[PDB]
């Protein structure tokens, strides 16, 4: 529940770095 | 003299694995030391003698204060803790030379 969805806030992070770059 | 530290935030002494990072910039993440509630202490292979752990649980912080001036240590740094096993992270500070 909420630990995957804090998980998953930090990952998005990750994925804006990388849609940024793409 | 040399210096360095840390602080926490929140719910004290859940402190579970509450682990440093280190990056230097253009390379990967990086764990350098780790300490727990139960005076757990270990470290990375590279910061025996460099560095040592410490706990506050008054104050809701955990220390790690450096030594053994060399610069390559300069880098971006990071902080956190586990709880629930949920990725925690920070922000960092940097290191020197001289």
């Known amino acids: 529940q909420i630990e995957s969805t804090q998980a998953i806030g930090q990952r998005y992070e990750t994925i804006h770095g990388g849609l940024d770059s793409i | 003299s040399l210096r360095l530290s840390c602080a926490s935030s929140?719910?004290?002494?859940?402190?579970?694995?509450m682990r440093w990072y280190r990056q230097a910039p253009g390379k990967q993440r990086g764990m350098v030391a780790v300490?727990?509630?139960?005076?757990?202490?270990n470290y990375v292979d590279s910061v025996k003698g460099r560095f040592i752990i410490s706990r506050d649980s008054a104050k809701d912080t955990v220390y790690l204060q450096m030594n053994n001036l060399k610069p390559e240590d300069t880098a971006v740094y990071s902080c956190?803790?586990?709880?629930?096993?949920?990725?925690?992270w920070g922000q960092g500070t940097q290191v020197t030379v001289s």
């Open positions: 956190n803790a586990i709880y629930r096993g949920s990725e925690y």
């Open positions: 929140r719910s004290i002494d859940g402190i579970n694995i």
């Open positions: 300490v727990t509630g139960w005076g757990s202490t």
